[PDB]
With several copies, the nearest count.
Chain A
Amino acid sequence: EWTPDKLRQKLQTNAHNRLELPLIMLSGLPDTVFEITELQSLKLEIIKNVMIPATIAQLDNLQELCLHQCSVKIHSAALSFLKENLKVLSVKFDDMRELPPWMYGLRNLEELYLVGSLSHDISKNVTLESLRDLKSLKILSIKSNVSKIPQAVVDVSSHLQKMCVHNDGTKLVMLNNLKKMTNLTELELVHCDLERIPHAVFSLLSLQELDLKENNLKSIEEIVSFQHLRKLTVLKLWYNSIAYIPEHIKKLTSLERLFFSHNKVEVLPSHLFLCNKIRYLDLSYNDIRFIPPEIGVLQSLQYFSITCNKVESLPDELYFCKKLKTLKIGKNSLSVLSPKIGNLLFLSYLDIKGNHFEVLPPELGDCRALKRAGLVVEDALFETLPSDVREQMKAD
C-alpha cells in the first residue's frame, strides 16, 4: 500500500525539530517505513495490534517516538535497539492497556509525555513504578486526571527534572510523593486543585521554576519557606485568586519571572519591588486600583505587565527605570501618555492598548525601541504625530 515515495510525501517536522512520519489509523506498520533510515521521529496514531520487528534497527536516526492510543507489541532486537537508541517518548493512553508495558525496559529514555486519563486506583499502576530501569529520564509531562502522585515519581526523583500535569478539574492529593522530590528543577501543575502551596515545594531545594496553574490559591502565606528554593526564578501564578500580596515576598530575591496575570490582587504593596533581581513581572487582566511609586526600586526589571487593570495613575518612576524592556499597561484607567517617555532608552515593548489617551507626545522619536506595533493603541491615538515626526518615524 505505502511505497517509499508516499512516505517521502508524508515526511514532515514536529514540535521537537525531528523528522516525523505521521501515520494515522493504519492497519499496521509497514517495513517500507523502516526502509527509511534518515527518520528521526515516529508518529503512530491508533495503530493497534502492532508488533515491532527487528527491522527498526535499519533506521539509526530515531530520537522521538509518538505511540498514540495504540497497543504495540515488541521483539527482542527491537528491545535492545530501542534501549540503546530511543530517548524521547510521547504516548497517549486512552485505554490503560493501550499503554504498552514495555516502555520501561529502556534506559536511554529522557523525555516522556504521558497524556491521557487515569482511574481511582492510581497506586496499582505498576507500569508507572518501573521507570527505575530508566536512568536518563529528565522530562515527564502527565496530562491525566491524576489525584495521587505515584511512588514511581518518588523513585525516579534522582534524575527527573520537569513536571507538567493537567488534571482538568481533578483534585491532586497525597503531596508527600512530591515532598520526596529531591533533584527536580521544574514543576508545572495545572488544575491540580491545590488550595495551598504544600511543604513539598519547599522540600525541593533545587527547583528552577514552579507553576501552580488553575490552582485555587486564595491566599499565599506559606512563602516563608520559599526562600529554600534559591534556584526559583519563575513563579507563574497566573489565572489565580491571590487577593493581596504580603511581605513574605522578601524571603526570596532570586525570583526573576513573576506571572500574576488575572489575579485577585487589589493593591500592590511596598514589598514586592524590594527584590531587585525581578525582571519579568506580569499582572495582565487584573483589577489593580492604582500603582504606588515604590515601583522605582525595580530597576533590573525588563517586563512589567499590568494590562487591563483599573490603574488610573502611573507615577513617573517606572518611566525613570530605563532597563525596563517590556512594560505592558494596556486597558487601564490612565489619562495621558508621559511626555518625558523618550528617557527610557531600553524600552522594547510598551503594550498600552485600549488606554483612554488623548494625544501622543512628540518625544516618541526619542524612544529608541518603541514602535506602533510596540505601542499598540487605538488608531485615533496612532494618528497623532507631527508631520516631521511622521517623516522621522516612517523611517524609524
Chain B
Amino acid sequence: VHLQKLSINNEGTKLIVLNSLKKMVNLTELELIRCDLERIPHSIFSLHNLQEIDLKDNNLKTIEEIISFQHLHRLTCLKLWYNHIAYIPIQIGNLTNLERLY
C-alpha cells in the first residue's frame, strides 16, 4: 500500500506469482531481474502505477502483452534489454508516450 519498488533477484529461479501481486497499487517500478519468466502474467499489466518495466534475462522469444497496457496510464519507459527477443511486431508503432525506450 506504501511500497513502490520490488526488485527480486533469484539467480535463475521461477516464482509462483498466481496473480497475488494485485495489491501493488502504489508500486511504480516492478523490476524482475533474471526471472527467466518467458511469459508476462496479467498482474504485470493490471497494476496501473507501473512505469519501469524491464524483463531482463527472462528469455522472451516473443513479447505480445503490450496491447493490454493502455489501461495503465503511467507507463513511460520500456527498457526491454538483455533478452532473446527475435522480432518486434509492427503494433509497437501504436505507442507514443515512451521516453527511454531501451
Q: Is there any pair of Cβ atoms, one from A and one from B, under 8 angstroms apart in the complex? A: yes
Q: Using a CB–CB distance below 8 Å, which chain A residues touch chain B?
A: 308, 331, 354, 356, 358, 378, 380
User: Of the candidates B1, B49, B73, B76, which one forms a contact with A308 in the assembled complex, judged by CB atoms under 8 Å apart?
Assistant: B1
**Quick one: CB contact mask for B41-63 with A, threshold 8 Å, 1 for yes?**
00000001101000000000000
Q: Given contacts A331-B26, A354-B26, are A378 and B49 in contact (CB under 8 A)?
A: yes
A358 touching B1, Cβ below 8 Å: no
Enumerate 17 A-B pairs (CB-CB under 8 Å) in ascending A order: A308-B1, A308-B2, A331-B1, A331-B25, A331-B26, A354-B25, A354-B26, A356-B25, A356-B48, A358-B73, A378-B28, A378-B49, A378-B74, A380-B51, A380-B73, A380-B74, A380-B76
Report the minimum CB–CB distance from A102 to chain B (whole Å).
Answer: 30
A312 CB to closest chain B CB, in angstroms? 13
Chain A positions within 8 Å of B28 at CB level: 378
- Whole-angstrom distance between the Cβ of A355 and the nearest chain B Cβ: 10
Q: Note all chain A residues with C-beta closer than 8 A to B1.
A: 308, 331
Scan B1-41; emit 1 where CB is below 8 A from any A CB, else 0.
11000000000000000000000011010000000000000
Residues of B within 8 A of A380 (CB): 51, 73-74, 76
Please report the number of residue pairs spanning A and B whose Cβ atoms sit closer than 8 angstroms. 17
**Chain B residues with CB below 8 A from A308, complex form:** 1-2
Distance in angstroms from B71 CB to nearest chain A CB is 11
B74 to chain A: which residues have CB within 8 Å? 378, 380
Q: Please, which residue of chain B has its CB at the minimum distance from the CB of A356?
A: B48
Most chain A beta-carbon neighbours within 10 Å: one of B1, B26, B48, B73: B73
Cβ contacts under 8 Å, B51 to chain A = 380
Q: Which A residues touch B73, using CB under 8 A?
A: 358, 380
B2, chain A: closest CB distance, angstroms? 8
Which residues from B are CB-within-8-Å of A356? 25, 48
- Closest CB-CB distance, A333 to chain B, in whole Å? 9
Whole-angstrom distance between the Cβ of B72 and the nearest chain A Cβ: 10
Contacts A331-B25, A354-B26, A380-B51 known; list 14 others, CB within 8 Å: A308-B1, A308-B2, A331-B1, A331-B26, A354-B25, A356-B25, A356-B48, A358-B73, A378-B28, A378-B49, A378-B74, A380-B73, A380-B74, A380-B76
Q: Which 7 A-B pairs have the closest CB atoms?
A: A380-B74, A354-B26, A356-B48, A380-B73, A358-B73, A378-B49, A378-B74
Instruction: Name, among A354, A358, A380, the residue most crowded by chain B CB atoms within 10 Å (CB to CB).
Output: A380
Residues from chain A with Cβ under 8 Å of B26 in the complex: 331, 354
Would you give the shortest CB distance from A316 to chain B, in whole angstroms?
A: 24
B76 / chain A contacts, CB cutoff of 8 Å: 380
Q: How far is the CB of A230 from chain B (nearest CB, A)?
A: 35
Name the residue on B nearest A308 (C-beta).
Answer: B1
Instruction: Note all chain A residues with C-beta closer than 8 A to B49.
Output: 378
Residues of B close to A354: CB separation below 8 A: 25-26
Hey, what's the 0/1 contact readout for B68-102 against A, CB within 8 Å counting as 1?
00000110100000000000000000000000000
What's the least CB distance linking A251 to chain B, in Å? Answer: 35
CB distance from A243 to the nearest CB of B (A): 20
What residues of chain B lie closer than 8 Å to A331, measured between beta carbons?
1, 25-26
Q: Taking the nearest CB of chain A, how far is it from the CB of B76, in angstroms? A: 7
Closest to A357 in B: B73
Residues on A with beta carbons closer than 8 Å to the beta carbon of B48: 356
For residue A358, which residues in chain B have a CB less than 8 angstroms away from its CB?
Answer: 73
Q: Of A308, A331, A378, which is in contact with the most chain B CB atoms at under 10 Å from its CB?
A: A378
**Minimum CB–CB distance for B45 against chain A, Å:** 15
Closest A residue to B26 by CB, please name it. Answer: A354
Question: Within the complex, what minimum Cβ distance (angstroms) separates B1 from chain A?
Answer: 7
CB distance from B30 to the nearest CB of A (A): 15
Q: Whole-angstrom distance from the CB of B69 to the nearest CB of chain A?
A: 13
**Minimum distance in angstroms from B73 CB to a CB of chain A:** 6
Q: How far is the CB of A359 from chain B (nearest CB, A)?
A: 9
Q: From B74, which residue of chain A is reached at the shortest CB distance?
A: A380
Closest to A355 in B: B25
